[PDB]
Subunit: 400 residues, 4 copies
């Protein structure tokens, strides 16, 4: 029964998550609008099977030590810096995030920013609020006909490309593991070739690439956007080439050092520069991304709890195995002790239970084995109890 | 010979204009990068047949009085407030502008601004430059799935609609003289219906529509963009509903009162408000629009000078008449004296010249007649000289 | 009153025409599902002001001689070969057709045929009906990636291009009066260049271009489609190059000689050839084109009857003149007698009526003058009666 | 060394396959343009590691018995009816086909056929070749504005939908495991709802659904296309409803009984019916699909031979396991003897070799295990030799 699985959701996680749990039979859901202090968290997590958090709840070894029943963590966000990932792994707890939910929010932002930057709209508006009047066409340009260079052509890169094309831009990309043409979108032979031949360069590197040398290769009057990785651009070098008037503008969402909360001062050498849009790491922060995150992370948690899939876990060996309509399914998390597979297989033989399929994956800390078997009822319970006792076992359970 | 037609171009008009004149046989082109003072202008215009200006050159009756040979004025811009239009008309001088060149520049701006406003990017960037850090999804939204309401569905309106659709917006329009559906773009039954059901309203009224009453009909959290007419919105009422937090943001390119140059202070009650983009009437100001203006206005001037077409003139009866490969073509500008048509026809009979087609259009000040006739050589010269002498005649010439 | 204007519609003209007349105030509509014989036609047309026909009704001088009141003919079809156009003109009767209604029907047909031809579907289906089984990929190809060459880039040509692009074709065009690029659609420098570099050539020449020499310039394995003009291709030469296997297929909707009705034998040297689609001049024949024709031709007839516009008439000088909300509007059709303009102007002066605008156009048979004037009531009636009496006058009327 | 792997390619497999093998280091390629007889096949396959065939080569148990070294079969085609799939499986030989290569060829065909059918082009062309002339708009329609109902919304279904939308059709789909909306493409609630509300129904069921009852639910004048599964439509019932004139046409590529080659008579009750396109199972038969098949199937074969992946094999447990840059990778195919996993694990322990990951999948005939291990050199050779000797082993090898 899934109504016995205690789901605890913190920090005002979207209602799309609560609904997804319910429709999956996970009706035992405690949903809070706030973060908890260490003490309330220790109390509340004490009986939790599944916890969902956002950016404020800190999940450390000390918390896991109190979490007697916890099987999985959902980070209802892109990042996972609030969870001790290795501590969770060593306790056989996968942590899931929402890596693709933000895609559309980042892509729209890039496209809007390309227009604002090529038109110099931000300095014009700052000036207008102050009483200035900068009515002039010089240095102001249409995006139609211009070349966008995209560095990293994954999910976001290609959505950015799609939208840029509908705006009449010529789109090129550089990506170390793709050279295919996509309709009118062509690969550049190299990063440098892309930099030299683009009017706007937007960084979309998958989770310094752009040094002063790279910036000086860009066309005079060109623009840089980085809404992807905070350590990818030398921002001191960017400030210099902007002040020289080599580059005409930039938009930057991510920084080498970002405030540890909205209640501490932000500093960057781009501050005070003309035609620079600075955004507080909000590329993925929309109401609609929050909704998609609620669904994405809950889907992962439901699938983990039902059938032990860990594909997409950020801290765990990635295992997926087609479920079967008969027999029983087991998972076993262990230390990587030599010969533990033998012990596991031996337990199954001993109980006359045949394994129909299995998937083992391992990393430096744990091995994770999921198995489909033909045992049923009490014979399966007995194999479970015995595999739990093999030395090096971290946890094991029966699955649907 | 067209190389005898003195073309004078002022204020750094795009080189696309100079080239268009040349390729048309108009090789006699004086091109200046600057505006002229009253005195230099009087001197330089004294022998000009065609003058092209931008925003700084003032063309008044006093100037036309000095312009012995002037047949046409090109305003290499959207507006025409620098030319005394009626004074030009009364002297039989059409003035041509570039009414459609700006279209793409306005449409791109609207689309970029919709994204910046729905995401609250401008206040976030102002805050970031000052050291603030506003990392939050609340009130921040994707444009995909949202409804854009377009008021005025002409050239710009429909381009705005095209681009908004490619960004996944649902697009509706209100226009008093169109109710047709265009693919997925549907008409609203009324202005109020459009206002009530849009997330963003963008004004594109062809050359106050939005009062406090209209603003209060808009959805709480909605956005207004006006990049079209400066007197269409009550900006004091807009400031109020923004401060109340009824509307979440606005972008405004045009104002009831705008500085008489970049060297005088701009004032608006929107100044200092959060999530308001203020732009100094630059909706049409791009390098690419300047290029298109150079071509558009030169095409009009060339066609006027060659065959007397005045369709598109902003101050003149609109006449167009298919040219014929034989005989002679005449134009005659006159005061609207009763019976002047009789006198004109009588002159033609007297010289045994038959009119094959003609188009007369008139307004409060002038009549403009273009005629195709079968006269040739000296017989045509004689009809010209005589029609020039009819009382009330302002000017007449032979055409190609 | 428009309910006094007798509209007679023949041959089952779409109901969209009847509705358009009604909504325009033209309520006096006799609508028949059939063609009439000479005798019934003479009787029925005797009091008709406006007649609409399709392909079977023959309108000759003899019929017009019986048509005491007829002002206009609507050919509710693309062609106009059933009307004596010159006879109508000489009686001051414009004839209007539906030149653009067919556009979409032709464009869809071309695109479907390109696929059938490149895949050799028609010979495969003929073979399958007869019990043959030609399962083979040889000579069978996808249209994606292929080059369509379009000869004549007007209305149909560009719609054909749009659709072909959505199917992943590269589209080029040759047109003697256009060299502009449209997005990804590029002009060829010449007809021969287009022929040599296309996989499929489709003819869309506006109302022999393709000789054996042209066919032999096409790529081996290429395809020709002619759904435009019946005399544009040497079909005997096409049959030869098809039998040689130089061209791989063709689709042809139009022929140098076509049966004078569906009740007479059709002959062409393409008959019996493999991978040739022969269609009986149905490129424009759809239920939806019939509907659009009903609207298009009725719009022309309504506008002619209301305000005398003849733009789009196939047999008449093309005149359009903006209507004014005051005074009176006149039209006058005449023989081209020298000095008739003088007589007309003199009549107007005599009655102290001032002409505010006018448009005269003429051809070899008639002059057509439309005039806006400031007369009202009985003064206008008197000018009408007198201009009707000027020698050479064919007809005249007051307009709205 | 891969140049030691004997690749034998038969029946004129596209050159894209030969190139893909070469670039992968598989240089030992014998490529024939023809099928082989039993005797030549037995000889040629005797030393083959990998064989590629098309539709004529028959691979039976008798052939496999002669194939001492064969590890994999490539069916360079969609179907696999020429290979004894179970016989191959029992010998531990996966068979790979090209399930997605045909997608574009099927989608284009459907779209062309929709146009031909709605326009009744095929009967018109049959008639024209015979001298008939059927110039008429009745029953002839544009596809723009019409509803396409798609049954099965997988790969082909959605490409069909994309293309149909670009042609201005409204597209709906019924699929038992999808209810999501895709842009403007909406799911129907049921098969019957889709049938009742479509103008054209196209079947794209993944590898009788449409009975007389279903056909009679379709709109009078509607069209059916089946280019997917040969047993999905009652063709006798289709012939009846066509003859009654309930349905206006059909296109059918696949039949309950199809000739065993191009040299035997084809029979179907649709033969001789008007507006029925019959195609000899060529929906996937293009030159471009043949090229894509060459690449697709070779990619599968290369990946199987290098790292033992069997995802996409049509006759084999589906196994994929991320490769590691160190240690050794093993595969083992066996009979499903209880306790064989224990024996395998025991062999590895005995040689002190640790397994880092593994994936077992099984079906009714075989178990297939792929393993990543930390053995190297001679220790790995010794484990290989010993696991080959476990009773029930079909084959085992080392991998890259």
């Amino acid at each position: 029964s899934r109504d016995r699985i205690n789901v605890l959701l913190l920090e005002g996680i979207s209602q799309t998550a609560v609904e997804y749990f319910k429709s999956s039979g996970y009706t035992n859901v405690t949903h809070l609008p706030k973060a908890l202090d260490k003490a309330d968290l220790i109390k509340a997590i004490s009986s939790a099977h599944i916890i969902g958090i956002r950016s404020r709840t800190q999940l450390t070894e000390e918390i896991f030590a109190a979490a007697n029943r916890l099987i999985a963590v959902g980070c209802f966000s892109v990042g996972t810096n609030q969870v001790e990932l290795k501590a969770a792994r060593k306790r056989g707890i996968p942590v899931f995030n929402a890596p693709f939910s933000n895609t559309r929010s980042v892509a729209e932002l890039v496209i809007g920013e390309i227009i604002m930057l090529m038109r110099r709209i931000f300095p014009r508006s700052v000036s207008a609020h102050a009483g200035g009047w900068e009515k002039t066409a010089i240095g102001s340009r249409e995006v139609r006909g211009k070349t966008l260079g995209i560095v990293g052509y994954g999910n976001i890169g290609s959505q950015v490309g799609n939208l840029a094309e509908s705006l009449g831009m010529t789109v090129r990309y550089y990506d170390t593991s793709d050279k295919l043409q996509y309709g009118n979108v062509k690969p550049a032979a190299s990063l440098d070739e892309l930099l030299k031949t683009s009017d706007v360069v937007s960084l979309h590197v998958p989770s310094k690439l752009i040094t002063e040398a790279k910036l000086r290769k860009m066309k005079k009057g060109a623009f840089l956007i980085n809404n992807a990785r905070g350590s990818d651009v030398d921002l001191e070098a960017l400030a210099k080439v902007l002040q020289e008037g080599h580059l005409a503008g930039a938009a930057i969402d991510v920084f080498p050092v970002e405030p540890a909360s909205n209640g501490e001062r932000f500093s960057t050498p781009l501050q005070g520069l003309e035609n620079v849009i600075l955004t507080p790491h909000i590329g993925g922060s929309t109401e609609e991304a929050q909704e998609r995150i609620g669904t994405e992370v809950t889907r992962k948690l439901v699938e983990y709890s039902d059938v032990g899939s860990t594909v997409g876990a950020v801290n765990f060996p990635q295992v997926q195995l087609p479920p079967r309509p008969t027999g029983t399914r087991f998972m076993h998390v262990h230390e990587n002790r030599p010969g533990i597979l033998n012990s596991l297989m031996n337990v199954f033989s001993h109980h006359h239970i045949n394994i129909a399929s299995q998937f083992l994956q391992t990393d430096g800390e744990v091995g994770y084995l999921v198995m489909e078997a033909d045992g049923v009822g009490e014979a399966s319970d007995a194999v479970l109890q015995e595999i739990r006792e093999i030395p090096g076992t971290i946890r094991a359970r029966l699955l649907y």
